[PDB]
Amino acid sequence: HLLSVAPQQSLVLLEDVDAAFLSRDLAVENPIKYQGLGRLTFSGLLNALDGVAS
Amino acid sequence: YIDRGIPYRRGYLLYGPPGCGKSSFITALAGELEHSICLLSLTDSSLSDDRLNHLLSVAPQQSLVLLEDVDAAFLSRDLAVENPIKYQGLGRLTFSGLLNALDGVAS
Amino acid sequence: EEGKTVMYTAVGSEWRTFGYPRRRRPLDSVVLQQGLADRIVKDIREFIDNPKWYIDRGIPYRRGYLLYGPPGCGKSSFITALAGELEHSICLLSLTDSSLSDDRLN
Amino acid sequence: HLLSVAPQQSLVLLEDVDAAFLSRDLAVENPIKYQGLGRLTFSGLLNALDGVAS
Amino acid sequence: ARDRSYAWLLSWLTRHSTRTQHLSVETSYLQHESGRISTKFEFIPSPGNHFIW
Amino acid sequence: MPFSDFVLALKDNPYFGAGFGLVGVGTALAMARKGAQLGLVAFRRHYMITLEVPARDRSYAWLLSWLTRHSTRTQHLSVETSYLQHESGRISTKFEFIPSPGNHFIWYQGKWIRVERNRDMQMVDLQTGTPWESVTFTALGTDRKVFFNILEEARALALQQ
Amino acid sequence: MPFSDFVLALKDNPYFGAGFGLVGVGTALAMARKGAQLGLVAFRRHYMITLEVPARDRSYAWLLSWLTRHSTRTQHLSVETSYLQHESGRISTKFEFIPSPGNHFIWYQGKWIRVERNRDMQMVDLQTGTPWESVTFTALGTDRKVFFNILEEARALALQQ
Ligand SMILES: Nc1ncnc2c1ncn2[C@@H]1O[C@H](COP(=O)(O)OP(=O)(O)OP(=O)(O)O)[C@@H](O)[C@H]1O
Ligand SMILES: Nc1ncnc2c1ncn2[C@@H]1O[C@H](COP(=O)(O)OP(=O)(O)OP(=O)(O)O)[C@@H](O)[C@H]1O
Ligand SMILES: [Mg+2]
Ligand SMILES: [Mg+2]
């Protein structure tokens, strides 16, 4: 929803993306764990950035 | 389907390396068939087995239910070999719940 | 609701109908191993037809069945066909729920 | 918000910064874990101290 | 409603209510002696003022 | 004694006559109030049609959309900002007006429907933002087909555009 | 007996004549209240325009900003402290006044708009601080273009300064 209602003529800025999810050894591992605080998932971010409803 | 008792349902799986045209093809197919797309996020927080069954039971007619990135909902491979298929998610969904919702008795 | 199968579900601590009455699946539309369907149907109908045999001996008037096997071989379809044949309804219970407790299960 | 509405002619004092986040061996490790109580993250502090909206 | 006296007195009010016509329904499953169970329609006096003798 | 003594005692005071004149006034006033309620109830039961729509149904969404579209020149609207993607490839703000809560009147099919956008009472509901909003279609007549036609046209308009 | 006996019984008491005189007073009083409501409803429906803005829309933000700017000499304001960065490089406190909740009157485009800053009712809302604040633009007339012009000018002012 937030990515769908951004003001026109604006730049969405996701700073320090690497801190959102586990990486490297975990990227090799089966799950890309969400090392965060909310209820966001790697698939959710992937589909929001470029998905069907983007 | 009716004359043989088979449930009138179908499901499709598109798999491959990222960026090869899965989501784009689904969008193009929905456009071609004049259907709509019902985006379902399995790894949600408010999603339960009963809620999943209800949601799959009240989908708008002439629509495609889209479960994107199914492999992220549940643990896999070594866990699939292991006894439980653990739900690596946020809500109260279980592997058996999804299995029975996709093709069960009340589907 | 005749000619169709009703499917209930657990809403709190009561069984409430889920959706609309599903159309019956014909029993012969499910092909099991030779004689299995007839055996199960005869057993369940014998259980239904004889409550006096249970009462006269003190046995609780209950029965349970277990269908096991590799996936996709016809367990759920056979259960639906059996519910249609016996003119019964199906009460779907999800053990791995969040609101389910021992007292609520009882 | 707090860093943006500090009273004029004031010094913001962050005392014992090393206790906010895990360090040394964790700094070598992939995540800089928040060894705290609230919902603050290393990237959040970094962007608040010197970021785009600072 | 914090006493078992409430339960006993409510049951006695259900039983001895004369021909009270301000009742409320209470569905329960009653196991017959034949071995099967059938729905039992039990009426409890609905909230209000009732008079007995 | 209460029967005979009071009758003489009441007859003694001329103010008693005015009081029982006022007693009849009170009895008539209570009767008139009762007459109003029964008349209203009978009129509603026999010559008016009402169709309430909760917020728990997709019918609510379709009917709300149809009310937004077909509102004639209603002047009790409320704003609803949305982003509309133009065919040129860009997106611009779209100012859409929905009838604000209140009593609005339409002239569908030669009748005078009295739609009413019910507001939020206690902010309790499910499967929505919990506003418990509703619409009530009231009209004069005995036929029910008008509301069925309205619902079918709302569904058709939802499947249109 | 109820018909004939009462008629004689009522006619016996002269206070009854004043009673039915008061009965007509009550009937006229009830009619007068009914006449008021229908008159108000008809007047609102036919000669007044209303535009409600919820707090769930960006239009609310733009309209609130435009109300802050264009308020003529309104003397029912409320304070709003903010830090304004001067061009010299330092920041100083800025005392900004927003019209406090109440009924304010403007003279936009030769009309007399009756904006009203709705207050908080129950502290329930989403995507905000949950105050459920609103504004209602009421004006006399039949044209709707005035409110559309107000909204467009609010958007332009938001994109300005
Ligand atoms: N066959 C194709 N023809 C045209 N464009 C394509 C094709 N395959 C991919 N693309 C382009 O790739 C981008 C993303 O494609 P798409 O989302 O369909 O990929 P995907 O296979 O679903 O991958 P992911 O799961 O990472 O989203 C879009 O810009 C889309 O136009
Ligand atoms: N013996 C059978 N005869 C006819 N159709 C069958 C049979 N076994 C499976 N099918 C068909 O396979 C599909 C799914 O079967 P079904 O749901 O009964 O499998 P299952 O083994 O009970 O699995 P699950 O427990 O996961 O539901 C249906 O289309 C059903 O018609
Ligand atoms: Mg994709
Ligand atoms: Mg099964």
Author numbering:
A (entry chain B), D (entry chain C): 268 to 321
B (entry chain A): 215 to 321
C (entry chain G): 162 to 267
E (entry chain F): 55 to 107
F (entry chain A), G (entry chain B): 1 to 161
Structure paper excerpt:
Bcs1L is a membrane-bound oligomer, with each subunit consisting of an N-terminal TM segment, a middle Bcs1-specific domain, and a C-terminal AAA domain that is highly distinct, forming a clade of its own in the broad AAA protein family. Here, we captured Bcs1L conformations by cryo-EM during active ATP hydrolysis in the presence or absence of ISP substrate. In contrast to the threading mechanism widely employed by AAA proteins in substrate translocation, subunits of Bcs1L alternate uniformly between ATP and ADP conformations without detectable intermediates that have different, co-existing nucleotide states, indicating that the subunits act in concert.
Two independent ATP states were identified in this work: ATP state-1 and ATP state-2. To obtain the best resolution for the TM region of mBcs1L structures, we performed 3D reconstructions in C7 symmetry for the two ATP-bound maps (ATP state-1 and ATP state-2) and the ADP-bound map. For example, in our ADP and ATP state-2 maps, we could trace the density all the way to the N-terminus of mBcs1L, depicting the structures of the entire N-termini exposed to the IMS to form the IMS seal, the complete TM helices, and additionally the apparent ordered densities that could be modeled as lipid molecules circling the base of the membrane basket. By contrast, the ATP state-2 reveals a near-complete structure of the TM region, showing a similar membrane-embedded basket encircled by TM helices as in the ADP state (right). For the ATP state-2, the TM helices pass through the MIM at an apparent tilting angle ϕ of 60°, leaning down more towards the membrane plane compared to the ADP state that has a tilting angle of 70°. This difference in ϕ results in a shallower TM basket and a slightly more opened IMS-seal with a diameter of ~13 Å, which is consistent with a previous observation by AFM showing the IMS seal undergoing an up-and-down movement during turnover. The EM density for TM region of mBcs1L structure in the ATP state-2 is the least well-defined with reduced local resolution, indicating elevated mobility in this region.
